[PDB]
Structures are given as C-alpha cells and as structure tokens.
Amino acid sequence: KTVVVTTILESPYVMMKKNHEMLEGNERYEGYCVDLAAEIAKHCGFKYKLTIVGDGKYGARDADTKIWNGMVGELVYGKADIAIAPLTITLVREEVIDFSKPFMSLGISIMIKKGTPIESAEDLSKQTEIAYGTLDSGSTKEFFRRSKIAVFDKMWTYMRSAEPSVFVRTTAEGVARVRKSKGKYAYLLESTMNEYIEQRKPCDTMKVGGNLDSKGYGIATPKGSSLGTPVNLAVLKLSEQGVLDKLKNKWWYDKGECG
Ligand SMILES: CC(C)S(=O)(=O)NC[C@H](C)c1ccc(-c2ccc([C@@H](C)CNS(=O)(=O)C(C)C)cc2)cc1
Ligand SMILES: N[C@@H](Cn1cc(F)c(=O)[nH]c1=O)C(=O)O
C-alpha cells in the first residue's frame, strides 16, 4: 500500500518548492524531512504520499475531551500511517503513539535580534522591558506550562498573562516578531529552528545562551503499527552511515548566508 505520511510546513524540514504550482504530489515539497522520508522509504521498501497536516499543528491533547489534534491526532485516529517531521519525543505522546529512536537532537533556546541585552532565560525572567514568547501549541509551550523550575515557572506565569499575547501561531510569526520589535521581543524556540534562521539573511537574529532542555525528534507511527520496527532500524542505519549528518549539513550549513 501507499504509505500516508503526515508532516508539517516548517523550515527547513518541509518547504514549498518555488514553482509548486506547476508541480504535483510529493514533488511539490523540499527540505530535510522530505529527503529523510525518501531515505526511510528506500530502506523500508515502501511507496508514500506526503500530506501537510490539516490544522497545521504538531499535536496536543485537549484537557477536557482528551482528543488529540495535529500530526499526533492524524496518527491516533487512523488518518495517517506515519509522521515524518520535527516532532518532539514526549512522555504524553509516547503513551499514545510510537516513536523511533531520535533522528535529530535539540533543546529549547532563545532567539534575539542582534544587539539585545539578553544572554539567558534568567536574564529574561529578571525583567519586563523585553517581552518574550513561545509557539502557542507544542512541546515548548508545554515545557514552560509544566516546569517546576523557578526561573521557567516565573517565565510561564509571565507569558500566560502578557497583554497583548506573546505567543505566536508559527515559527515564521515568532521570527518576524523578533525582527520587527527592535530588540523588545525575544522568542523561545527549538534550537534547530533557531540555528537554521541564524544562517539566513538578513542575518539579524542569533541564538543566545545554552539550551533549556535536551531532547530529540522522532519518527512516529500509530501504536502497535508494523511499520514501527523497520522505521526504527532505518533511523539507526541512517545514523550510523552518516546520512543524518549529511542531511543536517545540507539543509542548515552547506549554503549558509551569514558566514
Ligand atoms: C525525550 C528524551 C527521553 S530523549 O530525547 O529521547 N533523550 C534525552 C537525552 C538527553 C538525549 C537527547 C538527545 C539525544 C540524541 C542523540 C543523538 C541523536 C541522533 C543524532 C541519533 N540518535 S540515536 O538514537 O543515538 C541513533 C543510535 C539512532 C538524537 C538525539 C540523546 C539523548
Ligand atoms: N517540535 C514541537 C513543535 N515546536 C516547534 C518549534 F519550532 C518550536 O519552537 N517549539 C515547538 O514546540 C513539537 O513536536 O511539539
């Protein structure tokens, strides 16, 4: 059968090709996870169709109805066979879907407009002049909402009460907000995205400080799927053959624009 892959528009993992109007099917998209999908499919021996998740969400569970949205929802309710995306491995997700060993490491990080007098989360937490926010749904938001760490708790308590809202609906919105706010907004986002943006014109943002946590993205399958095992073996093989490194370099650094 043709494997249905759910994924999400997020640079440089999955992007629309420049002439995507005149192209169709999987050929409409480019990026790290596009390449990774091709590799995994080659190693597991399956045909596949790339589909952009309907609600443009990563995956969150409603506290009241217990219903999952986003890519995770697509997996749990039988809409997709596999998610190949920068989907963070988390405990609550692992309880309802299966993850491969991780294919890329990351941690929550801080993005500033160059010139901003901020070097750490503690720095942010100690002041109010510079606003700061996260993506409105996903593992970063959850990290802050659930954290028992003093500094991070202080930051969450600030963020959920800030007027107007400091949360954004896409990474693009967060980056744009950094660039337009003349140093008065800092954006908390996954280090991988931060590092990508740092390598792109107009070269006016930077990652500062260490990461706030350490985790990974994994390939996800519906719980108890037969695809789970071969997909995991493929991730291991791609890791050991240096393919994951080659792809990371390909999409992040090989054509860097900021030196
Ligand atoms: C959710 C967490 C439990 S976690 O993210 O899974 N682990 C946390 C821990 C600090 C950690 C975080 C990230 C990494 C890490 C290390 C390597 C990789 C890639 C490059 C290869 N993954 S692999 O499994 O080692 C490989 C042999 C295929 C991806 C993630 C390893 C350990
Ligand atoms: N990977 C996350 C989604 N996600 C993406 C980002 F770019 C980010 O900065 N924060 C975040 O939670 C998830 O799987 O929920």
Tab-separated table of all heavy atoms in Angstrom, residues 8 10-11 13 57-60 71-72 85-90 93 99 106-109 134-143 170-172 187-194 215-217, ligand 2:
chain	number	residue	atom	x	y	z
A	8	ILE	N	4.479	18.619	8.378
A	8	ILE	CA	4.077	19.988	8.684
A	8	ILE	C	5.014	20.976	7.987
A	8	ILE	O	6.204	20.692	7.795
A	8	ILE	CB	4.047	20.212	10.226
A	8	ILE	CG1	3.332	21.502	10.612
A	8	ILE	CG2	5.470	20.138	10.836
A	8	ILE	CD1	2.928	21.520	12.055
A	10	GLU	N	7.384	23.650	7.954
A	10	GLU	CA	8.318	24.220	8.913
A	10	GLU	C	9.702	24.168	8.286
A	10	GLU	O	10.179	23.100	7.915
A	10	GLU	CB	8.306	23.400	10.199
A	10	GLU	CG	9.231	23.924	11.273
A	10	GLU	CD	8.569	24.962	12.143
A	10	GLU	OE1	7.450	24.700	12.643
A	10	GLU	OE2	9.178	26.035	12.336
A	11	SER	N	10.351	25.318	8.157
A	11	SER	CA	11.651	25.365	7.504
A	11	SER	C	12.761	24.964	8.471
A	11	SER	O	12.709	25.301	9.652
A	11	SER	CB	11.915	26.773	6.967
A	11	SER	OG	10.848	27.210	6.145
A	13	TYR	N	12.578	21.876	7.253
A	13	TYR	CA	12.208	20.463	7.246
A	13	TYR	C	11.310	20.140	6.059
A	13	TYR	O	11.542	19.173	5.336
A	13	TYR	CB	11.503	20.081	8.552
A	13	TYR	CG	12.268	20.495	9.784
A	13	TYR	CD1	12.063	21.741	10.361
A	13	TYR	CD2	13.214	19.644	10.358
A	13	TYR	CE1	12.775	22.132	11.478
A	13	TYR	CE2	13.927	20.031	11.482
A	13	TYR	CZ	13.705	21.267	12.030
A	13	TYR	OH	14.400	21.649	13.151
A	57	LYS	N	-0.882	21.844	13.072
A	57	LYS	CA	-0.458	21.700	14.464
A	57	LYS	C	0.440	20.481	14.651
A	57	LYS	O	0.351	19.515	13.904
A	57	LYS	CB	-1.668	21.567	15.380
A	57	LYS	CG	-2.582	22.774	15.362
A	57	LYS	CD	-1.978	23.936	16.097
A	57	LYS	CE	-2.993	25.086	16.201
A	57	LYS	NZ	-2.352	26.346	16.602
A	58	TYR	N	1.304	20.530	15.660
A	58	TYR	CA	2.190	19.401	15.928
A	58	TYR	C	1.446	18.245	16.606
A	58	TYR	O	1.560	17.087	16.196
A	58	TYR	CB	3.388	19.859	16.760
A	58	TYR	CG	4.446	20.508	15.907
A	58	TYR	CD1	4.381	21.867	15.593
A	58	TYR	CD2	5.502	19.765	15.401
A	58	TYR	CE1	5.352	22.463	14.799
A	58	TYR	CE2	6.483	20.351	14.607
A	58	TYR	CZ	6.402	21.696	14.314
A	58	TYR	OH	7.370	22.272	13.518
A	59	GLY	N	0.678	18.567	17.640
A	59	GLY	CA	-0.054	17.556	18.380
A	59	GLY	C	-0.178	17.899	19.849
A	59	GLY	O	0.810	17.944	20.583
A	60	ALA	N	-1.410	18.157	20.276
A	60	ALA	CA	-1.705	18.489	21.662
A	60	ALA	C	-2.995	17.777	22.031
A	60	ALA	O	-3.811	17.502	21.156
A	60	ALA	CB	-1.871	20.009	21.832
A	71	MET	N	-0.478	16.397	13.949
A	71	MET	CA	0.039	15.148	13.410
A	71	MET	C	-0.246	13.965	14.322
A	71	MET	O	-0.549	12.866	13.849
A	71	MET	CB	1.549	15.259	13.155
A	71	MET	CG	1.866	16.278	12.071
A	71	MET	SD	3.634	16.403	11.739
A	71	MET	CE	4.097	17.514	13.070
A	72	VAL	N	-0.142	14.188	15.627
A	72	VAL	CA	-0.374	13.110	16.566
A	72	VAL	C	-1.815	12.633	16.407
A	72	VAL	O	-2.069	11.438	16.353
A	72	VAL	CB	-0.115	13.523	18.014
A	72	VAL	CG1	-0.459	12.379	18.951
A	72	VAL	CG2	1.354	13.937	18.193
A	85	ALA	N	8.600	14.387	10.546
A	85	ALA	CA	8.512	15.815	10.842
A	85	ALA	C	9.381	16.141	12.058
A	85	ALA	O	9.807	15.232	12.769
A	85	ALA	CB	7.055	16.178	11.132
A	86	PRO	N	9.626	17.439	12.320
A	86	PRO	CA	10.332	17.744	13.573
A	86	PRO	C	9.383	17.598	14.766
A	86	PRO	O	9.017	18.586	15.421
A	86	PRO	CB	10.751	19.201	13.392
A	86	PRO	CG	9.723	19.774	12.394
A	86	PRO	CD	9.471	18.624	11.454
A	87	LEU	N	8.978	16.359	15.019
A	87	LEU	CA	8.039	16.023	16.087
A	87	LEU	C	8.805	15.570	17.338
A	87	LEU	O	9.501	14.538	17.347
A	87	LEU	CB	7.076	14.922	15.607
A	87	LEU	CG	5.968	14.522	16.570
A	87	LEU	CD1	4.971	15.665	16.745
A	87	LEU	CD2	5.265	13.293	16.010
A	88	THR	N	8.702	16.369	18.391
A	88	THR	CA	9.431	16.105	19.622
A	88	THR	C	8.929	14.874	20.378
A	88	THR	O	7.728	14.696	20.576
A	88	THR	CB	9.341	17.344	20.528
A	88	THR	OG1	9.820	18.485	19.804
A	88	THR	CG2	10.143	17.158	21.812
A	89	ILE	N	9.862	14.021	20.795
A	89	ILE	CA	9.530	12.871	21.625
A	89	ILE	C	9.162	13.358	23.020
A	89	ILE	O	9.964	14.013	23.698
A	89	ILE	CB	10.727	11.914	21.726
A	89	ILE	CG1	11.066	11.343	20.345
A	89	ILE	CG2	10.434	10.810	22.745
A	89	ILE	CD1	12.491	10.710	20.240
A	90	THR	N	7.937	13.059	23.447
A	90	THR	CA	7.498	13.443	24.775
A	90	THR	C	6.788	12.284	25.452
A	90	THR	O	6.246	11.399	24.788
A	90	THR	CB	6.513	14.649	24.753
A	90	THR	OG1	5.268	14.242	24.178
A	90	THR	CG2	7.080	15.822	23.945
A	93	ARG	N	3.034	11.882	24.544
A	93	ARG	CA	2.872	11.362	23.194
A	93	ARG	C	3.231	9.873	23.140
A	93	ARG	O	2.509	9.091	22.518
A	93	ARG	CB	3.724	12.155	22.200
A	93	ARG	CG	3.112	13.518	21.873
A	93	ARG	CD	4.044	14.337	20.991
A	93	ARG	NE	3.475	15.663	20.741
A	93	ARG	CZ	4.171	16.693	20.274
A	93	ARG	NH1	5.470	16.554	20.021
A	93	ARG	NH2	3.576	17.862	20.072
A	99	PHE	N	7.406	6.164	18.888
A	99	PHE	CA	8.488	6.937	18.297
A	99	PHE	C	9.701	6.050	18.012
A	99	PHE	O	10.054	5.195	18.818
A	99	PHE	CB	8.967	8.009	19.274
A	99	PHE	CG	8.099	9.230	19.332
A	99	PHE	CD1	7.265	9.448	20.419
A	99	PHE	CD2	8.166	10.193	18.331
A	99	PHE	CE1	6.480	10.608	20.494
A	99	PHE	CE2	7.386	11.354	18.394
A	99	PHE	CZ	6.549	11.560	19.479
A	106	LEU	N	17.835	18.333	19.886
A	106	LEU	CA	17.530	19.749	20.044
A	106	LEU	C	17.241	20.077	21.490
A	106	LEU	O	17.082	19.184	22.320
A	106	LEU	CB	16.337	20.175	19.163
A	106	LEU	CG	14.874	19.713	19.356
A	106	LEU	CD1	14.753	18.189	19.546
A	106	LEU	CD2	14.151	20.477	20.456
A	107	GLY	N	17.129	21.374	21.774
A	107	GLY	CA	16.661	21.832	23.062
A	107	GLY	C	16.005	23.183	22.875
A	107	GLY	O	16.270	23.875	21.886
A	108	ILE	N	15.166	23.569	23.823
A	108	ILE	CA	14.545	24.885	23.770
A	108	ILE	C	15.659	25.921	23.936
A	108	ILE	O	16.593	25.718	24.717
A	108	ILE	CB	13.500	25.017	24.857
A	108	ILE	CG1	12.329	24.076	24.562
A	108	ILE	CG2	12.995	26.464	24.945
A	108	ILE	CD1	11.472	23.825	25.745
A	109	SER	N	15.580	27.005	23.170
A	109	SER	CA	16.632	28.007	23.118
A	109	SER	C	16.038	29.394	22.977
A	109	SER	O	14.831	29.562	22.763
A	109	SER	CB	17.537	27.756	21.918
A	109	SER	OG	16.812	27.926	20.711
A	134	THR	N	6.482	31.924	23.179
A	134	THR	CA	6.718	30.642	22.502
A	134	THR	C	5.671	30.398	21.417
A	134	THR	O	4.703	31.159	21.290
A	134	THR	CB	6.654	29.435	23.474
A	134	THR	OG1	5.287	29.196	23.853
A	134	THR	CG2	7.511	29.667	24.713
A	135	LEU	N	5.871	29.341	20.637
A	135	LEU	CA	4.835	28.826	19.745
A	135	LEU	C	3.644	28.463	20.627
A	135	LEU	O	3.822	27.945	21.726
A	135	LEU	CB	5.363	27.601	18.994
A	135	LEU	CG	4.495	26.986	17.898
A	135	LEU	CD1	4.427	27.942	16.717
A	135	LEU	CD2	5.092	25.656	17.484
A	136	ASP	N	2.428	28.739	20.159
A	136	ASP	CA	1.254	28.614	21.029
A	136	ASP	C	0.820	27.198	21.392
A	136	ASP	O	0.014	27.002	22.305
A	136	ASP	CB	0.061	29.398	20.453
A	136	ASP	CG	-0.552	28.736	19.234
A	136	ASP	OD1	0.120	27.926	18.569
A	136	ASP	OD2	-1.731	29.017	18.944
A	137	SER	N	1.348	26.211	20.681
A	137	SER	CA	0.961	24.840	20.911
A	137	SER	C	2.177	23.998	20.578
A	137	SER	O	2.874	24.280	19.604
A	137	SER	CB	-0.207	24.468	19.998
A	137	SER	OG	-0.618	23.131	20.218
A	138	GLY	N	2.442	22.995	21.399
A	138	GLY	CA	3.566	22.106	21.138
A	138	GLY	C	4.439	21.908	22.351
A	138	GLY	O	4.139	22.420	23.432
A	139	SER	N	5.548	21.193	22.168
A	139	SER	CA	6.395	20.814	23.293
A	139	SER	C	7.075	21.965	24.046
A	139	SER	O	7.347	21.842	25.237
A	139	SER	CB	7.425	19.744	22.875
A	139	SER	OG	8.230	20.187	21.794
A	140	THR	N	7.341	23.085	23.374
A	140	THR	CA	7.976	24.222	24.044
A	140	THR	C	6.985	24.868	25.043
A	140	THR	O	7.300	25.078	26.246
A	140	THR	CB	8.491	25.258	23.009
A	140	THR	OG1	9.447	24.626	22.146
A	140	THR	CG2	9.193	26.440	23.707
A	141	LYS	N	5.772	25.121	24.548
A	141	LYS	CA	4.728	25.693	25.383
A	141	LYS	C	4.533	24.802	26.597
A	141	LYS	O	4.524	25.279	27.739
A	141	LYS	CB	3.409	25.838	24.602
A	141	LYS	CG	2.357	26.699	25.297
A	141	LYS	CD	1.439	25.903	26.239
A	141	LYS	CE	0.630	24.879	25.483
A	141	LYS	NZ	-0.567	24.384	26.262
A	142	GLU	N	4.442	23.494	26.350
A	142	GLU	CA	4.219	22.537	27.418
A	142	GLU	C	5.366	22.504	28.412
A	142	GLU	O	5.146	22.271	29.606
A	142	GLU	CB	3.985	21.130	26.856
A	142	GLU	CG	2.591	20.946	26.296
A	142	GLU	CD	1.506	21.202	27.334
A	142	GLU	OE1	1.362	20.390	28.276
A	142	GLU	OE2	0.792	22.208	27.202
A	143	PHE	N	6.588	22.692	27.914
A	143	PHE	CA	7.745	22.702	28.787
A	143	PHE	C	7.568	23.806	29.802
A	143	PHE	O	7.786	23.600	30.993
A	143	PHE	CB	9.031	22.943	27.998
A	143	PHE	CG	10.248	23.162	28.863
A	143	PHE	CD1	11.023	22.090	29.268
A	143	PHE	CD2	10.634	24.446	29.242
A	143	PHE	CE1	12.148	22.291	30.055
A	143	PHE	CE2	11.748	24.653	30.031
A	143	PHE	CZ	12.514	23.569	30.435
A	170	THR	N	3.040	30.469	14.440
A	170	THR	CA	4.034	29.764	13.639
A	170	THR	C	5.418	30.282	13.994
A	170	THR	O	5.552	31.368	14.551
A	170	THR	CB	3.848	29.991	12.130
A	170	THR	OG1	3.993	31.388	11.838
A	170	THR	CG2	2.481	29.483	11.646
A	171	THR	N	6.438	29.494	13.678
A	171	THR	CA	7.809	29.951	13.838
A	171	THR	C	8.038	31.229	13.023
A	171	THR	O	8.694	32.154	13.489
A	171	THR	CB	8.801	28.869	13.429
A	171	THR	OG1	8.467	27.651	14.108
A	171	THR	CG2	10.240	29.278	13.791
A	172	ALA	N	7.474	31.282	11.818
A	172	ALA	CA	7.606	32.461	10.965
A	172	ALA	C	7.125	33.722	11.677
A	172	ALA	O	7.769	34.769	11.596
A	172	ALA	CB	6.850	32.271	9.661
A	187	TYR	N	12.312	35.423	21.392
A	187	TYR	CA	11.472	34.285	21.044
A	187	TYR	C	12.115	33.009	21.558
A	187	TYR	O	13.295	32.776	21.355
A	187	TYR	CB	11.277	34.211	19.533
A	187	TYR	CG	10.273	33.172	19.088
A	187	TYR	CD1	9.038	33.045	19.720
A	187	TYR	CD2	10.558	32.331	18.024
A	187	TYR	CE1	8.118	32.082	19.301
A	187	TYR	CE2	9.650	31.380	17.597
A	187	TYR	CZ	8.439	31.251	18.238
A	187	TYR	OH	7.554	30.287	17.804
A	188	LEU	N	11.329	32.203	22.254
A	188	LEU	CA	11.803	30.918	22.752
A	188	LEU	C	11.354	29.851	21.765
A	188	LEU	O	10.147	29.716	21.463
A	188	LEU	CB	11.242	30.659	24.153
A	188	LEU	CG	11.803	31.571	25.255
A	188	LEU	CD1	10.744	31.821	26.320
A	188	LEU	CD2	13.050	30.929	25.870
A	189	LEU	N	12.316	29.098	21.248
A	189	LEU	CA	12.016	28.149	20.187
A	189	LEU	C	13.048	27.038	20.162
A	189	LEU	O	14.099	27.153	20.765
A	189	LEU	CB	11.974	28.826	18.814
A	189	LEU	CG	13.299	29.147	18.120
A	189	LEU	CD1	13.063	29.602	16.682
A	189	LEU	CD2	14.057	30.227	18.884
A	190	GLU	N	12.749	25.968	19.443
A	190	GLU	CA	13.669	24.831	19.401
A	190	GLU	C	14.965	25.232	18.719
A	190	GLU	O	14.960	25.957	17.728
A	190	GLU	CB	13.001	23.607	18.758
A	190	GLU	CG	11.870	23.115	19.658
A	190	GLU	CD	11.075	21.951	19.105
A	190	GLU	OE1	11.040	21.763	17.878
A	190	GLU	OE2	10.492	21.227	19.931
A	191	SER	N	16.072	24.775	19.299
A	191	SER	CA	17.407	25.187	18.893
A	191	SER	C	17.700	24.933	17.425
A	191	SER	O	18.400	25.716	16.795
A	191	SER	CB	18.463	24.495	19.762
A	191	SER	OG	18.367	23.087	19.639
A	192	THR	N	17.159	23.850	16.889
A	192	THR	CA	17.321	23.501	15.484
A	192	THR	C	16.770	24.585	14.529
A	192	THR	O	17.431	24.973	13.551
A	192	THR	CB	16.616	22.186	15.228
A	192	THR	OG1	15.396	22.201	15.967
A	192	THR	CG2	17.473	21.034	15.752
A	193	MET	N	15.553	25.061	14.800
A	193	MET	CA	14.984	26.153	14.010
A	193	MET	C	15.794	27.435	14.171
A	193	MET	O	16.116	28.103	13.188
A	193	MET	CB	13.509	26.397	14.366
A	193	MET	CG	12.558	25.305	13.843
A	193	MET	SD	12.623	23.761	14.791
A	193	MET	CE	11.048	22.987	14.345
A	194	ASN	N	16.119	27.756	15.421
A	194	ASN	CA	16.910	28.935	15.777
A	194	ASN	C	18.219	28.969	14.975
A	194	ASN	O	18.546	29.972	14.316
A	194	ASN	CB	17.191	28.891	17.284
A	194	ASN	CG	17.564	30.246	17.864
A	194	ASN	OD1	17.787	31.211	17.135
A	194	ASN	ND2	17.605	30.323	19.187
A	215	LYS	N	16.618	17.114	24.129
A	215	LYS	CA	15.729	16.043	23.676
A	215	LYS	C	15.938	15.753	22.205
A	215	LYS	O	16.957	16.150	21.628
A	215	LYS	CB	14.263	16.380	23.984
A	215	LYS	CG	13.799	17.713	23.405
A	215	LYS	CD	12.624	18.304	24.214
A	215	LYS	CE	12.350	19.740	23.786
A	215	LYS	NZ	11.256	20.333	24.615
A	216	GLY	N	14.972	15.070	21.594
A	216	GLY	CA	15.096	14.700	20.200
A	216	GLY	C	13.779	14.653	19.459
A	216	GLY	O	12.703	14.578	20.068
A	217	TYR	N	13.877	14.714	18.135
A	217	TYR	CA	12.733	14.477	17.259
A	217	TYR	C	12.711	13.006	16.893
A	217	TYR	O	13.751	12.407	16.669
A	217	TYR	CB	12.877	15.277	15.967
A	217	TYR	CG	12.888	16.777	16.103
A	217	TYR	CD1	13.673	17.542	15.255
A	217	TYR	CD2	12.089	17.442	17.043
A	217	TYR	CE1	13.685	18.907	15.336
A	217	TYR	CE2	12.118	18.826	17.143
A	217	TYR	CZ	12.914	19.550	16.277
A	217	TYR	OH	12.970	20.923	16.334
B	2	LIG	N1	8.607	20.170	17.843
B	2	LIG	C1	7.492	20.698	18.629
B	2	LIG	C2	6.805	21.880	17.933
B	2	LIG	N2	7.652	23.068	18.089
B	2	LIG	C3	8.294	23.553	17.023
B	2	LIG	C4	9.094	24.678	17.169
B	2	LIG	F1	9.734	25.216	16.124
B	2	LIG	C5	9.208	25.295	18.495
B	2	LIG	O1	9.928	26.306	18.636
B	2	LIG	N3	8.538	24.764	19.534
B	2	LIG	C6	7.749	23.679	19.350
B	2	LIG	O2	7.117	23.214	20.319
B	2	LIG	C7	6.503	19.613	18.921
B	2	LIG	O3	6.724	18.475	18.439
B	2	LIG	O4	5.517	19.899	19.637
